[PDB]
């Protein structure tokens, strides 16, 4: 649910602003897409058995598709890293309160555990 | 990870439930007698520690308490005898050296063998203190305490590995060779321990001399322990039977060792109850087989068990009695079905899943009881004003009364269903309803109260 | 497989206390496994407590309460495979409870009532306090003044302590609800 | 549904706090991502038949993708272990009540079985 | 929908408690995860043709992934077995009523068929 | 959720119009579909071992399917690029306010991070 | 990688204007990348502006405002990798603003108030206008008459212009909502 | 693995301040890892703070507060693997706080009250201000006038500062809700 | 990344808590005595910097403050002696050259060795200034300051690598060969440093001459440092024991070095407290073993430790005492279980997880204490009006009173539950309730208040 994600991030940013610490989340990164020439170079392994020579040049589309899949996985991992950073920064700001620290921390980490479970569901 | 057996658990539970109070200084410990209520003997708590050592982790709190009591009841390395409560009709304790303090050393060593490194260090320190004190004089101490010292030294050498203990006990052996019923029993026990460690014939010669030499129950318990050390079935069984003649046992909880059946003050003397526990557990661990463990026997008059032999796969009990009568034997076991044989008449028996119990009638002459576990073609069996309706009517009336009164006082319905809940509670408190209808109406009232709160 | 106890359970514990048990499983390959602790008087009548899953190591740490009976069997169950039970003899607490309200140090008002009259008195007091709370605050007043009245009952010799947890449970769920209602869409 | 997960965790933490036992859930772990060099070393098996020598070096992207998949599965398993720990701790706290133990336990284990069924759905 | 699952289980437990039979559902089991060494031993089949010797040791990640997949399927089956047991116990308790047996049974089995259809959807 | 996407885009366009900068979003591009002849030419690698000649012409449907898959991935990437452009243009318009810049930027970037998380979910 | 400026940033710009920067990245393979422009007085105190993702070419076009300080550092950040900053000396605008209302051509009523009295006068005027709008139209009247009153304040020497955008932001979201409420199910 | 401190924690810090710690992990392969900082008096009684996940580099930067006790143990925990703690001796702040209200420069009204009377006075003042806020504005008035009353208490010698954050937390969630209610369907 | 040990932390914490105030110019720094309160000696802050150099990053703020103080207390390269507060009964500071300013150079060099490049540059600049000033005259300066200058030059050559320092110290060596207790101690310390750097026999000859040559505590601290440099266990241990005879130590926080036990003004003279810290840490780092670190010893009367040798795996302390009495030794350690031996009586001891402490009774003659860490067969153990119910009733009454009063004043229920919350707070403020019930009711009131706000 994107609505829950946005609500958690909005609560995070509002609380951060209310502590007179204006810090906005930076846009997530995206893994580099795989070029066609990279796939062509990947599937250029030619070998020479005693029966003759053969090369896996015609397997270019398969390795291009595999490269797209690994790009998908890498982008998912980068988004995971960004949201982990959001988690860390939020509770780093939260942990400085002297006495009411533990309880506010429990509630904030419950909310950001909802966030992290959304991330885990995204992983699968 | 080991668990205490039923007899030890019962004895310690009875002693703790009855013989546990507050010491003058602050640490909870055992007093001496139910009637005295004043004296706190560190020796007695040492006896309890000896009784409970093999399963120490079970009674962790009580052992910690008595260890603290011993720690604050020792001056340098030697323990004092009493911590007396002053009789009304800052330390209050006689400072004389405590008799059978070698028993204290043995108890601490036994605790150290199974764990409790604090107890082991305590035993080592008190060992050194009393050994120096003895070398100061020679052999001018209590003899039974000396025998228990030899036992403690043997255990310490077994579990610590320090070589000096070896030499010490050898010298200590000479002292025991340099020298009542109970003291003779402990002397023979130390003789047997010395033979078991060094295998020298003279120790056996002295031990068999004590054997051939052979009221106030404890003496019988030391005699049984001595006979268990020797290996004589007749003497050990007779002494343990004399021990059992005057004990009170119920199946679930209680196992009380009286101090004298003939005496007016039977009670539970703390000097003997741990001794009785040690005697019973020693007899069971040594002479009884792996599963079928005989720990209690009610023998009226002067009936005494003579032999208990695990011949092949069947247990034989040879017993002597007087003026017929019936004895009652209780065996700790796991098996459910097994057949007993009194003489040759195939009598029946009672057996729970953990305790079996036989109550046969025995002839005046010597008689044999043959118990065969897991037998083929088993023969023995395993056999052993107002009224309710008026109260129910009154309960219905009371329930309707309180519900209507609540609705009249407060027009809200949530308060009414809450009062229905509390009315179920009230009518259960007076036992006017059976628990079935009370619980059903209580659950219904709970769910309906929450529904009514939701519907507002 | 087989199950074992890494910590000795304390025999003869207090009447209504709790103790930790350290139970470890055998041929557990790498996964957490279920368990349940059936505690009760006599092996036939067992009341189930302590759900949960053991660690991947195969060792689970659990809490076991003690019932008000002379003999209590505690049975760790793997829920499918082997199980084991042990017996404990907790100290019995007398049905009648005597309470001493200390005033001006030495003087103490000591009294003890039969369990039925104490229960009915506490029940009527709970009625009065819950009704007053409903009139004053509202539906949340029911819970708040129930807690207050049960506290004032526990101060006297009245309804036992564990009843509080019931209310303390029912509040918790409600709280969760409101928190959720302030988080999602 | 992340909302149900958050509600269950919030009820758990609120009840734990109300028993005067302040313990917050720790962040879940994440399985280590597979490096490119690890995949290259994995697909470095070269064999020498009588017809000639050939190596599966060009199969690097396929094994990299398989490594990403096993990372996904391992992360799912780690999240499963963390939520199982939450389950165990919650009912360990719940089981200490003397008399009302069984019934409160039934209700709490129903709620945490909703939690565990959410976990099982996450597994698939 | 986890909410429907929880509602069905709550109705089951409430009705069981109301019949004075306090029995809570036990936590579901989880299939054993596959260790790395198990996958290594699985892909250790080496064969010796007249052209030479070759082993499928480099196919370790593929069989590790297949082992994770079969673990997923086995865990799904174990959850299925647990919920089938819940089904059986619920209607075993329900079937003892003398006369109103069939009708209450029809309604309860409709509810638990909603449960079983949720299970079937989980299978796919 | 398409409704959240539309709401974010509508807020973006309304705010852009209110700043007297009338600029509508351009339609997203779609990657070129793969023709049958392209797949036929891809799988036309014939090789001549000493044992004989063989060609992978019969593998045409497999490479056609792989081409469709890479088309799907490329279209997803193009949509990603378009929405990234929308992100950039929105906050480029937003960043020009003199003093209230940072706070309005925080809120707008939270909303467009909801947008970007919807995009990331689309990627997976 | 490295980041560079394809367009020279104008030194000495007006007080509250904006300028475009043309920043291009190096070894960006083929994907858009994040950036952020921290603008502020002294490198320690930077206020973040201009989120967004650069084009696949590796070049991003961004807008940078100028603060009311003598020295302003503008720092383009790749958000993870290398960053670079440059200093700009914008023209300082005096705190006191003098406004000339021209009537009948040549004659002009010129006046200037201290910033505090101008701020409080504008605040009270905003109160009056927003209350009148609430009485007249409603909750949307709040926004409409806030815009009107802030316009009439900007006509005088009163509350600065950018406050408008705040309201102009808050209306926009509301509008989006209603549009969504008229589209989906 | 092993965990280490890249920055030395300042011994003897002020009573209620905070300090940054720079803790880096060893054999972390490439992934972020959890951590928790248990800070408290004596190693047995630790209160948990500072959840979060370290960077992929293996180094995490965290904030640690200081309790009002002579000896404080701060324990970084990897949450599963190795952990380490260090002791810090923060300066103790006296229970009684003396406040000086300066009027007309040199003259200063100085006073200090016992903590109990100050707490009860602040509590009654919070009652009065929150009730007045509820009467005036509404449910949001509760929060607004609670903040105002707690400010006016902090001006005097009254309720400590951190209470504000509690309210400042509770407002934030509410704000989030309304924002969400104006975004989705 | 290093962390300060417990003794250094305790001493610096005590000095900072007691001896930290505001300098006349603005930078916080240490004054001289608790009673004087006026004079601020830059030399004293240099002594503190010397004490805290090895763990400088821990006390970053205080070191930065005192470094700023030194920066504004130096004219060109030579520091002034005092920054006096005028006695009431713009710079106010006597401009005479500060005694033991070579100590200041040594402190800055020691700070520079472990980091703080500002301190290193300061040390180099002041080194050049004072070396030129000395070459102007020859050897007409303070001799102990000259010895500390040789030490600082040695450190600077160690960490900078500039060759001129080498030549300088050689010439400086001659000056020290050209020339009270404390000055003799520093001269011997510089002799030992010169031998350690150049390995020339004449420096050892002079150092052993000072050795054979051998109130106001500091002199004893310099003597202990000199003996530590030499390597004589007897002299160094005797001096450090004389140091410890008049210190006040508690386990958690305080470690105060008095300036004179017999004198009326014991206090904490800042000239000696950092010196005592340096002496203690030097003795621990050099003579104590890796883990078992002895840093404090309460020796009543004139008892003094003579030898501390780590023989194999056991620590030996040879100690001399008078008129029996009991000394108390405190060791910094990590291990929990280890056995101490006073003479041969196996006395017990106290040990936390970080500090162990022994309090034995010692004979008048020389006695040996043998501490064996991680030993086999451990012997020593590890042992060391109204009332509440009336107040609870009053608290219940007050709670109900305030709730009812609030409901009467305002008919709203949300205000009522908020008042219940604040009533829990109030009744906790007066300590009428235990924290358990107060917290439970507070949390319940919080959640119920939010529920009531939701339900409106």
PDB file of N, CA and C in Angstrom, chain E residues 52-102:
ATOM      1  N   UNK E  52      36.410 -37.805 -21.383  1.00  0.00           N
ATOM      2  CA  UNK E  52      37.023 -37.179 -20.228  1.00  0.00           C
ATOM      3  C   UNK E  52      36.077 -37.174 -19.044  1.00  0.00           C
ATOM      4  N   UNK E  53      36.545 -36.547 -17.970  1.00  0.00           N
ATOM      5  CA  UNK E  53      35.802 -36.451 -16.723  1.00  0.00           C
ATOM      6  C   UNK E  53      35.204 -35.061 -16.579  1.00  0.00           C
ATOM      7  N   UNK E  54      33.972 -34.993 -16.076  1.00  0.00           N
ATOM      8  CA  UNK E  54      33.347 -33.707 -15.788  1.00  0.00           C
ATOM      9  C   UNK E  54      32.376 -33.866 -14.626  1.00  0.00           C
ATOM     10  N   UNK E  55      32.285 -32.821 -13.804  1.00  0.00           N
ATOM     11  CA  UNK E  55      31.441 -32.801 -12.619  1.00  0.00           C
ATOM     12  C   UNK E  55      30.535 -31.583 -12.661  1.00  0.00           C
ATOM     13  N   UNK E  56      29.334 -31.724 -12.109  1.00  0.00           N
ATOM     14  CA  UNK E  56      28.404 -30.601 -12.007  1.00  0.00           C
ATOM     15  C   UNK E  56      28.529 -29.889 -10.664  1.00  0.00           C
ATOM     16  N   UNK E  57      29.758 -29.519 -10.299  1.00  0.00           N
ATOM     17  CA  UNK E  57      29.974 -28.749  -9.080  1.00  0.00           C
ATOM     18  C   UNK E  57      29.589 -27.287  -9.252  1.00  0.00           C
ATOM     19  N   UNK E  58      29.803 -26.726 -10.442  1.00  0.00           N
ATOM     20  CA  UNK E  58      29.465 -25.331 -10.689  1.00  0.00           C
ATOM     21  C   UNK E  58      27.964 -25.085 -10.739  1.00  0.00           C
ATOM     22  N   UNK E  59      27.148 -26.139 -10.786  1.00  0.00           N
ATOM     23  CA  UNK E  59      25.698 -26.011 -10.733  1.00  0.00           C
ATOM     24  C   UNK E  59      25.170 -25.952  -9.306  1.00  0.00           C
ATOM     25  N   UNK E  60      26.025 -25.627  -8.340  1.00  0.00           N
ATOM     26  CA  UNK E  60      25.578 -25.521  -6.952  1.00  0.00           C
ATOM     27  C   UNK E  60      24.518 -24.446  -6.736  1.00  0.00           C
ATOM     28  N   UNK E  61      24.658 -23.213  -7.242  1.00  0.00           N
ATOM     29  CA  UNK E  61      23.611 -22.211  -6.978  1.00  0.00           C
ATOM     30  C   UNK E  61      22.247 -22.592  -7.526  1.00  0.00           C
ATOM     31  N   UNK E  62      22.195 -23.264  -8.677  1.00  0.00           N
ATOM     32  CA  UNK E  62      20.909 -23.635  -9.264  1.00  0.00           C
ATOM     33  C   UNK E  62      20.182 -24.625  -8.365  1.00  0.00           C
ATOM     34  N   UNK E  63      20.898 -25.638  -7.874  1.00  0.00           N
ATOM     35  CA  UNK E  63      20.258 -26.609  -6.997  1.00  0.00           C
ATOM     36  C   UNK E  63      19.947 -26.012  -5.632  1.00  0.00           C
ATOM     37  N   UNK E  64      20.738 -25.038  -5.178  1.00  0.00           N
ATOM     38  CA  UNK E  64      20.381 -24.322  -3.957  1.00  0.00           C
ATOM     39  C   UNK E  64      19.063 -23.571  -4.130  1.00  0.00           C
ATOM     40  N   UNK E  65      18.887 -22.911  -5.275  1.00  0.00           N
ATOM     41  CA  UNK E  65      17.637 -22.211  -5.546  1.00  0.00           C
ATOM     42  C   UNK E  65      16.467 -23.186  -5.652  1.00  0.00           C
ATOM     43  N   UNK E  66      16.687 -24.334  -6.298  1.00  0.00           N
ATOM     44  CA  UNK E  66      15.636 -25.342  -6.397  1.00  0.00           C
ATOM     45  C   UNK E  66      15.274 -25.870  -5.012  1.00  0.00           C
ATOM     46  N   UNK E  67      16.272 -26.022  -4.142  1.00  0.00           N
ATOM     47  CA  UNK E  67      16.004 -26.448  -2.773  1.00  0.00           C
ATOM     48  C   UNK E  67      15.191 -25.403  -2.022  1.00  0.00           C
ATOM     49  N   UNK E  68      15.482 -24.122  -2.245  1.00  0.00           N
ATOM     50  CA  UNK E  68      14.662 -23.082  -1.628  1.00  0.00           C
ATOM     51  C   UNK E  68      13.224 -23.145  -2.133  1.00  0.00           C
ATOM     52  N   UNK E  69      13.044 -23.404  -3.428  1.00  0.00           N
ATOM     53  CA  UNK E  69      11.695 -23.510  -3.980  1.00  0.00           C
ATOM     54  C   UNK E  69      10.934 -24.684  -3.371  1.00  0.00           C
ATOM     55  N   UNK E  70      11.592 -25.840  -3.255  1.00  0.00           N
ATOM     56  CA  UNK E  70      10.907 -26.987  -2.668  1.00  0.00           C
ATOM     57  C   UNK E  70      10.644 -26.740  -1.187  1.00  0.00           C
ATOM     58  N   UNK E  71      11.494 -25.950  -0.521  1.00  0.00           N
ATOM     59  CA  UNK E  71      11.192 -25.543   0.848  1.00  0.00           C
ATOM     60  C   UNK E  71       9.935 -24.688   0.906  1.00  0.00           C
ATOM     61  N   UNK E  72       9.786 -23.760  -0.042  1.00  0.00           N
ATOM     62  CA  UNK E  72       8.581 -22.934  -0.093  1.00  0.00           C
ATOM     63  C   UNK E  72       7.347 -23.813  -0.240  1.00  0.00           C
ATOM     64  N   UNK E  73       7.409 -24.772  -1.165  1.00  0.00           N
ATOM     65  CA  UNK E  73       6.262 -25.649  -1.402  1.00  0.00           C
ATOM     66  C   UNK E  73       5.965 -26.497  -0.168  1.00  0.00           C
ATOM     67  N   UNK E  74       7.008 -27.018   0.483  1.00  0.00           N
ATOM     68  CA  UNK E  74       6.804 -27.848   1.666  1.00  0.00           C
ATOM     69  C   UNK E  74       6.201 -27.044   2.812  1.00  0.00           C
ATOM     70  N   UNK E  75       6.641 -25.797   2.991  1.00  0.00           N
ATOM     71  CA  UNK E  75       6.054 -24.948   4.021  1.00  0.00           C
ATOM     72  C   UNK E  75       4.586 -24.666   3.721  1.00  0.00           C
ATOM     73  N   UNK E  76       4.260 -24.426   2.449  1.00  0.00           N
ATOM     74  CA  UNK E  76       2.861 -24.245   2.072  1.00  0.00           C
ATOM     75  C   UNK E  76       2.051 -25.487   2.420  1.00  0.00           C
ATOM     76  N   UNK E  77       2.603 -26.671   2.140  1.00  0.00           N
ATOM     77  CA  UNK E  77       1.893 -27.910   2.454  1.00  0.00           C
ATOM     78  C   UNK E  77       1.709 -28.087   3.958  1.00  0.00           C
ATOM     79  N   UNK E  78       2.721 -27.723   4.749  1.00  0.00           N
ATOM     80  CA  UNK E  78       2.598 -27.838   6.201  1.00  0.00           C
ATOM     81  C   UNK E  78       1.527 -26.898   6.743  1.00  0.00           C
ATOM     82  N   UNK E  79       1.477 -25.667   6.231  1.00  0.00           N
ATOM     83  CA  UNK E  79       0.415 -24.745   6.627  1.00  0.00           C
ATOM     84  C   UNK E  79      -0.945 -25.307   6.233  1.00  0.00           C
ATOM     85  N   UNK E  80      -1.019 -25.930   5.055  1.00  0.00           N
ATOM     86  CA  UNK E  80      -2.258 -26.564   4.617  1.00  0.00           C
ATOM     87  C   UNK E  80      -2.680 -27.640   5.609  1.00  0.00           C
ATOM     88  N   UNK E  81      -1.732 -28.475   6.032  1.00  0.00           N
ATOM     89  CA  UNK E  81      -2.057 -29.536   6.981  1.00  0.00           C
ATOM     90  C   UNK E  81      -2.546 -28.963   8.305  1.00  0.00           C
ATOM     91  N   UNK E  82      -1.899 -27.899   8.785  1.00  0.00           N
ATOM     92  CA  UNK E  82      -2.320 -27.291  10.044  1.00  0.00           C
ATOM     93  C   UNK E  82      -3.740 -26.739   9.949  1.00  0.00           C
ATOM     94  N   UNK E  83      -4.058 -26.053   8.851  1.00  0.00           N
ATOM     95  CA  UNK E  83      -5.400 -25.487   8.740  1.00  0.00           C
ATOM     96  C   UNK E  83      -6.438 -26.585   8.529  1.00  0.00           C
ATOM     97  N   UNK E  84      -6.070 -27.673   7.849  1.00  0.00           N
ATOM     98  CA  UNK E  84      -6.964 -28.826   7.760  1.00  0.00           C
ATOM     99  C   UNK E  84      -7.252 -29.390   9.145  1.00  0.00           C
ATOM    100  N   UNK E  85      -6.230 -29.445  10.002  1.00  0.00           N
ATOM    101  CA  UNK E  85      -6.442 -29.891  11.375  1.00  0.00           C
ATOM    102  C   UNK E  85      -7.388 -28.960  12.122  1.00  0.00           C
ATOM    103  N   UNK E  86      -7.245 -27.649  11.913  1.00  0.00           N
ATOM    104  CA  UNK E  86      -8.158 -26.693  12.544  1.00  0.00           C
ATOM    105  C   UNK E  86      -9.592 -26.950  12.090  1.00  0.00           C
ATOM    106  N   UNK E  87      -9.772 -27.151  10.783  1.00  0.00           N
ATOM    107  CA  UNK E  87     -11.065 -27.512  10.206  1.00  0.00           C
ATOM    108  C   UNK E  87     -11.662 -28.725  10.917  1.00  0.00           C
ATOM    109  N   UNK E  88     -10.868 -29.794  11.005  1.00  0.00           N
ATOM    110  CA  UNK E  88     -11.351 -31.047  11.573  1.00  0.00           C
ATOM    111  C   UNK E  88     -11.734 -30.876  13.035  1.00  0.00           C
ATOM    112  N   UNK E  89     -10.886 -30.204  13.818  1.00  0.00           N
ATOM    113  CA  UNK E  89     -11.174 -30.031  15.238  1.00  0.00           C
ATOM    114  C   UNK E  89     -12.419 -29.181  15.452  1.00  0.00           C
ATOM    115  N   UNK E  90     -12.568 -28.108  14.671  1.00  0.00           N
ATOM    116  CA  UNK E  90     -13.733 -27.244  14.816  1.00  0.00           C
ATOM    117  C   UNK E  90     -15.022 -28.021  14.601  1.00  0.00           C
ATOM    118  N   UNK E  91     -15.123 -28.744  13.487  1.00  0.00           N
ATOM    119  CA  UNK E  91     -16.389 -29.440  13.274  1.00  0.00           C
ATOM    120  C   UNK E  91     -16.525 -30.710  14.105  1.00  0.00           C
ATOM    121  N   UNK E  92     -15.421 -31.272  14.602  1.00  0.00           N
ATOM    122  CA  UNK E  92     -15.530 -32.342  15.586  1.00  0.00           C
ATOM    123  C   UNK E  92     -16.189 -31.834  16.860  1.00  0.00           C
ATOM    124  N   UNK E  93     -15.807 -30.636  17.305  1.00  0.00           N
ATOM    125  CA  UNK E  93     -16.500 -30.028  18.436  1.00  0.00           C
ATOM    126  C   UNK E  93     -17.948 -29.704  18.085  1.00  0.00           C
ATOM    127  N   UNK E  94     -18.190 -29.254  16.852  1.00  0.00           N
ATOM    128  CA  UNK E  94     -19.531 -28.834  16.456  1.00  0.00           C
ATOM    129  C   UNK E  94     -20.520 -29.984  16.310  1.00  0.00           C
ATOM    130  N   UNK E  95     -20.059 -31.198  16.008  1.00  0.00           N
ATOM    131  CA  UNK E  95     -20.968 -32.264  15.604  1.00  0.00           C
ATOM    132  C   UNK E  95     -21.670 -32.956  16.768  1.00  0.00           C
ATOM    133  N   UNK E  96     -21.369 -32.594  18.014  1.00  0.00           N
ATOM    134  CA  UNK E  96     -21.905 -33.328  19.154  1.00  0.00           C
ATOM    135  C   UNK E  96     -23.292 -32.867  19.587  1.00  0.00           C
ATOM    136  N   UNK E  97     -23.800 -31.767  19.048  1.00  0.00           N
ATOM    137  CA  UNK E  97     -25.116 -31.269  19.471  1.00  0.00           C
ATOM    138  C   UNK E  97     -26.199 -32.234  18.997  1.00  0.00           C
ATOM    139  N   UNK E  98     -27.150 -32.612  19.858  1.00  0.00           N
ATOM    140  CA  UNK E  98     -28.076 -33.708  19.531  1.00  0.00           C
ATOM    141  C   UNK E  98     -28.959 -33.494  18.309  1.00  0.00           C
ATOM    142  N   UNK E  99     -29.773 -32.440  18.309  1.00  0.00           N
ATOM    143  CA  UNK E  99     -30.846 -32.280  17.338  1.00  0.00           C
ATOM    144  C   UNK E  99     -30.544 -31.178  16.332  1.00  0.00           C
ATOM    145  N   UNK E 100     -29.994 -30.056  16.787  1.00  0.00           N
ATOM    146  CA  UNK E 100     -29.719 -28.924  15.910  1.00  0.00           C
ATOM    147  C   UNK E 100     -28.378 -29.137  15.222  1.00  0.00           C
ATOM    148  N   UNK E 101     -27.848 -30.353  15.330  1.00  0.00           N
ATOM    149  CA  UNK E 101     -26.589 -30.724  14.731  1.00  0.00           C
ATOM    150  C   UNK E 101     -26.435 -30.356  13.269  1.00  0.00           C
ATOM    151  N   UNK E 102     -27.296 -30.903  12.404  1.00  0.00           N
ATOM    152  CA  UNK E 102     -27.116 -30.677  10.959  1.00  0.00           C
ATOM    153  C   UNK E 102     -27.099 -29.215  10.539  1.00  0.00           C
TER     154      UNK E 102
END
